[PDB]
Amino acid sequence: STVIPGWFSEMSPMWPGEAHSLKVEKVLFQGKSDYQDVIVFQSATYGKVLVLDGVIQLTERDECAYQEMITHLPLCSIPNPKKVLVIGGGDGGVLREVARHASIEQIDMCEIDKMVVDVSKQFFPDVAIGYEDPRVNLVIGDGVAFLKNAAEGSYDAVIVDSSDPIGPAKELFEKPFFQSVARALRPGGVVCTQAESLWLHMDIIEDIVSNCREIFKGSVNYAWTSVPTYPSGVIGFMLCSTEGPDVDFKHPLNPIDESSSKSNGPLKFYNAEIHSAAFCLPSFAKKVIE
Amino acid sequence: ACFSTVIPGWFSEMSPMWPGEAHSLKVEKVLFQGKSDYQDVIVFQSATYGKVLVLDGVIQLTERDECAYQEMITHLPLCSIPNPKKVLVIGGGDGGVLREVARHASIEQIDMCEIDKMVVDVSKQFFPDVAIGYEDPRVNLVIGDGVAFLKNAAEGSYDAVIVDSSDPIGPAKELFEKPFFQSVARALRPGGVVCTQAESLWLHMDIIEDIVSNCREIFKGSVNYAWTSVPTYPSGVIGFMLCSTEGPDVDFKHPLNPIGPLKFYNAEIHSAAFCLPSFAKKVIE
Amino acid sequence: STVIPGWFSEMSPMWPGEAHSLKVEKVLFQGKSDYQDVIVFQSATYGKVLVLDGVIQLTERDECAYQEMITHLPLCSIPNPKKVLVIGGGDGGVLREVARHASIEQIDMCEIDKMVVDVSKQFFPDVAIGYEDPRVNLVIGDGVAFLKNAAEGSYDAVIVDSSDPIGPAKELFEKPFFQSVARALRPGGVVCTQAESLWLHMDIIEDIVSNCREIFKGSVNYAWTSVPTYPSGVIGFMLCSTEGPDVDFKHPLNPIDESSSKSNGPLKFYNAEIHSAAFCLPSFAKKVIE
Amino acid sequence: ACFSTVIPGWFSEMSPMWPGEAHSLKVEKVLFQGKSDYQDVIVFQSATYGKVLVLDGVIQLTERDECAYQEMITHLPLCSIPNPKKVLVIGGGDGGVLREVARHASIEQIDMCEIDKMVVDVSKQFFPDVAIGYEDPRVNLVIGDGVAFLKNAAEGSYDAVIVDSSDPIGPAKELFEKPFFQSVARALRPGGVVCTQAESLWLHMDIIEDIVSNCREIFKGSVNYAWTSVPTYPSGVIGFMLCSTEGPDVDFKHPLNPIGPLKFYNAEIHSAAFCLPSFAKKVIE
């Protein structure tokens, strides 16, 4: 066969037999750091694209879906979060999403790979803005260690913007991590972590539900969302709360209506209907995840 | 063999309808590759998705996710109206819509209007799996111009019309314009409903706006828009327009006539489809 | 971090703290197979690059050096070779280099990755030709085992166009693999293997040399040659013969000249003098490697 | 500055003297930076390559591989002629070449002409295992202009001149032109030898062709060429022009006067450096 040139194709064994492609406009930077083969390129129709170890880490055109999601789903499910921990901010947009919340005192943007943080701040504009927030506390270092040596009940929310459980990052999906997460969460605190796709990782996702269930006394839930530039297009999330005040993940307490940010910036892919709808899972998975 | 693509031995769906991006599947074996008086037809064997159906290069369906679109396009509307009996389907498919429409044991006559006689063969022959949709009694198959049969047909004789059409890549743009949505308004009974495939919020919020607009002028009852996840469709989602004629008030947002078992559709899911995202919810005010 | 964008930088733990880079002109093919990461891009001043698992495999500008040296250092060293075997598709250029030898009756390459044989041959001209020669039999699929199914003493030479000893190819440097080459070769048969750089892997090179000093009982020799696009600027080779007629890798019995392949093009890098010069090692390595 | 970098926090060596490519080293810490009356003197600590000396954004030397260039450039000449007594070195900011020359007992005096005291200093404060070379009894260090030093030199008063320059791009371009060579010629005793840094075969087969042309015009004895492996120089290799004036024969391909021991250069390597690749052997037969 003959392959038409000019295209970038996302391929993984984690999603075999299929691939999402993007016409590359211009190469902006590729390098294998100590942790990952990083890449930043200008696509044809999706703008700038960040790729880590092969997997499209994010896209400008639809970053709002993941960012607003992984962030606001848990942040709007609890009253006035003040101290929030962010692990894996491979861009700073998730961080930007946080700044929308006025009650936020400080965020511990804990990222480990500096090639990324650097390459993100340069090429990505509205993305590099996050790190700039005053309340932000950036720290280049390991994440699992950061959470072990973490004070007890100091955080209001834990957001794991991790990648996939392929190599040493598999910890962030195992029980030793979830227990390390809960330790840092105060009673009633919440954690949100991406949990792969329903069309491709039932088994994996299922283990994650069992794990979170055997660690959180609160209400562990799985909500999914739409994001085109992701594998299959339906990446999910785990929402868990610790023993303490009840947390209704299905009905945000302080949902960002739109004006609840007004002069800050317009919400692109989030509102009160999406937050609840997000949870409605398909039958085939509904029975399993329960 | 494999000629057009951006990956060896793999099929890549690309078109000016979603340029700059493409979705690809590992071709196990190309089963059928022919041409009708309408378009190019291909049925390649998937290594991880099952049987595949491609029309003019656009993946129409695969075995792995034929449940989503199908349990979406037929039940969203068919679960709304109470006790539907007369249903009109316009489109090819692999018999899936039928597999699902026939689930509504309430219906009586199921007129299906597939114009491309070749899409029928391939579905019937190559997809014996859901091709049973045809082999059902309640079903009345018709090979001819969709816009035809409809236009030239009794009035108020239908409870629902499902436009399982293809994307507006040309001649089918007619199924997105006012004259068609009028032929549907007549053909439907009072309080009757329409459910048509309506682009992707991620890719055509503008075309989707022209559709919402057109429909909004023709239907004085209830007009709605719903989107569902379908991995094999560009952007990962596909939209639907839900409209009701003059008469009894319909609430598409909530299933009034609820129901192997279903795989994607379920009360909750049904209401989800009507929770468009912000940037999208804006325009489609 | 005001990095000039538009450059591909070759990186690997195999060479910490250093990197080759090329101002990319345009992307031609960038995806991933079952075995490795792949890239084919139009560089600004080196024509076309080909990368496997993030490691520059070849440049049309300087691919002559490697392909010409890896092929002729062994062949020219032996008279009238008839049946030779090559492992590691790469691109076919090496395959093309073997073709220059008129006495060859059959050539066989074993690229365990059809994507490479496909994408490469497809985007490269004077490279695909290798697969073109009538004497070739492209046996796609693991070659370490290929020799296992090979008849004893059925080859005059074995050329291991492998990659860095990091991927699964790390086995291609182990004693068991070499024992099969020895038994697959006729008595007096020669082997030539990509053997890293003296500037970066002296320790490793000693173990590789040790292993051939055991498996192969003929003459053992470490040759090296300038190769711009490989890390450190140079590359090594192991020339080994099995017990039988003696083989002097240092003084070629019949080096290529030009008229020997008039219609194949003149030789761009190889010549008798550069052949002998290849076996002259710098002092620091000389002492160690003896 | 941190402009010429294709990797944040790293030093990227880019220049029109070899466009389209670039050598980069991970920077552990910057040790010195200044703008002398001549050029930029960058000096940092490379994560795993030792202290690197950088001038006008071009790698001048790295502790890890100084031995190659230094050993070859110095012993190529000094080992082709018998009993060298007086030797001149131009632009040897580092001391490494000096150290190398001083290894030749027969030498009674080593002349040095560096046009920038700053470098000799930066080198003295940061490169011990080389700058040591400045402190030899026979070394006559001079700070001034080399083409002038040669122009003022007494006729036939040198056994060997070492021309350690940069690139024929700026003011140092005059060192690759006939005027300067003739000057170097007048200065050499009869049968004397000069060794000039003559770029990469992979990058300048044209610039290297003009040089071979001038030297072949000015010199009547011998005018050869040698290339050696130096990882940190563009293309991983760099060349040398070896010339000998009218007088005793001089065979550079075979060191007539063969030599802490040297870590690179040896007799075999010495002759090996004259075996050029075919594509190169053509342009400069």
mmCIF file of C-alpha atoms in Angstrom, chain C residues 49-199:
data_model
loop_
_atom_site.group_PDB
_atom_site.id
_atom_site.type_symbol
_atom_site.label_atom_id
_atom_site.label_comp_id
_atom_site.label_asym_id
_atom_site.label_seq_id
_atom_site.Cartn_x
_atom_site.Cartn_y
_atom_site.Cartn_z
ATOM 1 C CA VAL C 49 15.247 10.884 7.308
ATOM 2 C CA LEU C 50 13.889 7.627 8.669
ATOM 3 C CA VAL C 51 13.520 7.081 12.421
ATOM 4 C CA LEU C 52 12.728 3.963 14.463
ATOM 5 C CA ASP C 53 11.782 4.204 18.154
ATOM 6 C CA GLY C 54 13.124 7.759 18.097
ATOM 7 C CA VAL C 55 16.512 6.799 16.688
ATOM 8 C CA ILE C 56 17.764 8.135 13.367
ATOM 9 C CA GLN C 57 18.136 5.058 11.172
ATOM 10 C CA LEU C 58 19.261 6.699 7.978
ATOM 11 C CA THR C 59 19.683 9.851 5.907
ATOM 12 C CA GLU C 60 19.806 9.843 2.100
ATOM 13 C CA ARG C 61 22.692 12.289 2.428
ATOM 14 C CA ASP C 62 25.033 9.995 4.385
ATOM 15 C CA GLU C 63 23.398 6.557 4.234
ATOM 16 C CA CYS C 64 26.155 5.583 1.797
ATOM 17 C CA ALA C 65 28.788 5.430 4.544
ATOM 18 C CA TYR C 66 26.936 2.922 6.710
ATOM 19 C CA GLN C 67 25.253 0.789 4.067
ATOM 20 C CA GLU C 68 28.402 0.702 1.920
ATOM 21 C CA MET C 69 30.749 -0.131 4.827
ATOM 22 C CA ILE C 70 28.501 -2.673 6.535
ATOM 23 C CA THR C 71 28.063 -4.536 3.266
ATOM 24 C CA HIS C 72 31.517 -4.439 1.696
ATOM 25 C CA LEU C 73 33.765 -4.776 4.727
ATOM 26 C CA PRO C 74 32.626 -8.407 4.948
ATOM 27 C CA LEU C 75 31.802 -9.395 1.368
ATOM 28 C CA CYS C 76 34.847 -7.913 -0.358
ATOM 29 C CA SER C 77 36.775 -9.744 2.373
ATOM 30 C CA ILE C 78 35.676 -13.097 0.988
ATOM 31 C CA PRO C 79 35.968 -14.336 -2.616
ATOM 32 C CA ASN C 80 32.912 -14.942 -4.807
ATOM 33 C CA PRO C 81 30.292 -14.999 -2.077
ATOM 34 C CA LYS C 82 27.169 -16.730 -3.417
ATOM 35 C CA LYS C 83 24.526 -17.029 -0.680
ATOM 36 C CA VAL C 84 24.414 -14.219 1.869
ATOM 37 C CA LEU C 85 21.764 -13.314 4.447
ATOM 38 C CA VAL C 86 20.770 -9.918 5.859
ATOM 39 C CA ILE C 87 18.737 -9.268 9.038
ATOM 40 C CA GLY C 88 16.911 -5.993 9.663
ATOM 41 C CA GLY C 89 15.077 -4.509 6.682
ATOM 42 C CA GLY C 90 16.031 -0.941 7.475
ATOM 43 C CA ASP C 91 15.409 0.502 4.013
ATOM 44 C CA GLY C 92 16.873 -1.757 1.339
ATOM 45 C CA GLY C 93 19.941 0.333 0.598
ATOM 46 C CA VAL C 94 22.159 -2.256 2.275
ATOM 47 C CA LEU C 95 20.146 -4.713 0.205
ATOM 48 C CA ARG C 96 21.122 -2.623 -2.810
ATOM 49 C CA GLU C 97 24.774 -2.637 -1.772
ATOM 50 C CA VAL C 98 24.872 -6.435 -1.717
ATOM 51 C CA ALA C 99 23.461 -6.433 -5.266
ATOM 52 C CA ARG C 100 26.673 -4.783 -6.476
ATOM 53 C CA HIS C 101 28.319 -8.208 -6.049
ATOM 54 C CA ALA C 102 27.893 -10.171 -9.270
ATOM 55 C CA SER C 103 28.756 -13.576 -7.757
ATOM 56 C CA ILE C 104 25.860 -13.420 -5.307
ATOM 57 C CA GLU C 105 23.177 -15.964 -6.210
ATOM 58 C CA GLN C 106 20.592 -15.249 -3.522
ATOM 59 C CA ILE C 107 19.984 -12.399 -1.117
ATOM 60 C CA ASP C 108 17.651 -12.542 1.874
ATOM 61 C CA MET C 109 16.533 -9.781 4.226
ATOM 62 C CA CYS C 110 14.432 -10.275 7.321
ATOM 63 C CA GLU C 111 12.638 -7.163 8.447
ATOM 64 C CA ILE C 112 10.345 -8.110 11.321
ATOM 65 C CA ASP C 113 8.335 -4.994 10.527
ATOM 66 C CA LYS C 114 6.428 -4.827 7.230
ATOM 67 C CA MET C 115 5.476 -1.239 7.981
ATOM 68 C CA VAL C 116 9.147 -0.287 7.615
ATOM 69 C CA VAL C 117 9.647 -2.267 4.430
ATOM 70 C CA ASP C 118 6.470 -0.578 3.188
ATOM 71 C CA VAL C 119 6.739 3.025 4.291
ATOM 72 C CA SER C 120 10.476 3.179 3.562
ATOM 73 C CA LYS C 121 10.699 1.536 0.145
ATOM 74 C CA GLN C 122 7.702 3.736 -0.648
ATOM 75 C CA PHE C 123 9.228 7.123 0.171
ATOM 76 C CA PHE C 124 12.789 6.299 -0.901
ATOM 77 C CA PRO C 125 14.113 5.853 -4.494
ATOM 78 C CA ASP C 126 17.673 4.492 -4.582
ATOM 79 C CA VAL C 127 16.661 2.474 -1.539
ATOM 80 C CA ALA C 128 13.620 0.469 -2.612
ATOM 81 C CA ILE C 129 15.731 -1.081 -5.382
ATOM 82 C CA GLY C 130 17.213 -3.423 -2.798
ATOM 83 C CA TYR C 131 13.910 -5.303 -2.496
ATOM 84 C CA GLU C 132 13.757 -5.120 -6.285
ATOM 85 C CA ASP C 133 16.721 -7.356 -7.139
ATOM 86 C CA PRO C 134 15.548 -10.788 -8.419
ATOM 87 C CA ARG C 135 17.973 -12.504 -6.061
ATOM 88 C CA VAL C 136 16.163 -11.160 -3.015
ATOM 89 C CA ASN C 137 13.615 -13.040 -0.897
ATOM 90 C CA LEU C 138 12.113 -10.615 1.617
ATOM 91 C CA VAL C 139 11.260 -12.872 4.562
ATOM 92 C CA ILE C 140 9.405 -10.499 6.886
ATOM 93 C CA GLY C 141 9.511 -11.703 10.464
ATOM 94 C CA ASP C 142 11.823 -12.317 13.412
ATOM 95 C CA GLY C 143 15.253 -13.277 12.146
ATOM 96 C CA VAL C 144 16.834 -14.364 15.421
ATOM 97 C CA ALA C 145 14.746 -17.488 14.900
ATOM 98 C CA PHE C 146 15.323 -17.442 11.132
ATOM 99 C CA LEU C 147 18.885 -18.605 11.649
ATOM 100 C CA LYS C 148 17.461 -21.259 13.981
ATOM 101 C CA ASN C 149 15.573 -22.750 11.045
ATOM 102 C CA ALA C 150 18.569 -22.224 8.759
ATOM 103 C CA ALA C 151 20.568 -25.159 7.411
ATOM 104 C CA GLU C 152 24.028 -25.526 8.910
ATOM 105 C CA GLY C 153 26.815 -24.042 6.787
ATOM 106 C CA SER C 154 24.362 -22.661 4.228
ATOM 107 C CA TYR C 155 25.559 -19.038 4.139
ATOM 108 C CA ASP C 156 28.774 -17.282 3.047
ATOM 109 C CA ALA C 157 27.965 -14.174 5.109
ATOM 110 C CA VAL C 158 25.528 -12.702 7.631
ATOM 111 C CA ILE C 159 24.903 -8.967 7.933
ATOM 112 C CA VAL C 160 23.091 -7.731 11.023
ATOM 113 C CA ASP C 161 21.565 -4.365 10.153
ATOM 114 C CA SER C 162 20.168 -4.060 13.663
ATOM 115 C CA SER C 163 19.208 -1.041 15.765
ATOM 116 C CA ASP C 164 20.391 0.033 19.220
ATOM 117 C CA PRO C 165 20.714 -2.750 21.853
ATOM 118 C CA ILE C 166 17.808 -1.197 23.758
ATOM 119 C CA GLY C 167 14.726 -2.516 21.980
ATOM 120 C CA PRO C 168 14.040 -6.258 21.555
ATOM 121 C CA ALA C 169 17.133 -6.322 19.320
ATOM 122 C CA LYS C 170 19.307 -6.381 22.457
ATOM 123 C CA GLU C 171 19.261 -10.154 21.928
ATOM 124 C CA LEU C 172 21.050 -9.776 18.586
ATOM 125 C CA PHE C 173 24.144 -9.052 20.698
ATOM 126 C CA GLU C 174 23.846 -12.132 22.924
ATOM 127 C CA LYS C 175 25.971 -15.277 22.585
ATOM 128 C CA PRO C 176 23.068 -17.614 21.580
ATOM 129 C CA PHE C 177 22.249 -15.508 18.502
ATOM 130 C CA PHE C 178 25.890 -15.509 17.427
ATOM 131 C CA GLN C 179 26.102 -19.289 17.816
ATOM 132 C CA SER C 180 23.347 -19.635 15.235
ATOM 133 C CA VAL C 181 25.147 -17.316 12.836
ATOM 134 C CA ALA C 182 28.230 -19.485 13.233
ATOM 135 C CA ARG C 183 26.330 -22.678 12.489
ATOM 136 C CA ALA C 184 24.350 -21.014 9.684
ATOM 137 C CA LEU C 185 27.605 -19.995 7.998
ATOM 138 C CA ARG C 186 29.927 -22.188 5.942
ATOM 139 C CA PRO C 187 33.277 -22.855 7.556
ATOM 140 C CA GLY C 188 35.173 -19.595 7.108
ATOM 141 C CA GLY C 189 31.900 -17.673 6.960
ATOM 142 C CA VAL C 190 31.888 -14.021 7.983
ATOM 143 C CA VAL C 191 29.581 -11.935 10.141
ATOM 144 C CA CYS C 192 29.323 -8.193 10.254
ATOM 145 C CA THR C 193 27.204 -6.587 12.916
ATOM 146 C CA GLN C 194 26.325 -3.010 13.759
ATOM 147 C CA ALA C 195 28.468 -2.570 16.862
ATOM 148 C CA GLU C 196 27.864 0.825 18.459
ATOM 149 C CA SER C 197 30.417 3.634 18.977
ATOM 150 C CA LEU C 198 33.832 3.621 20.673
ATOM 151 C CA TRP C 199 33.153 7.094 22.034
#
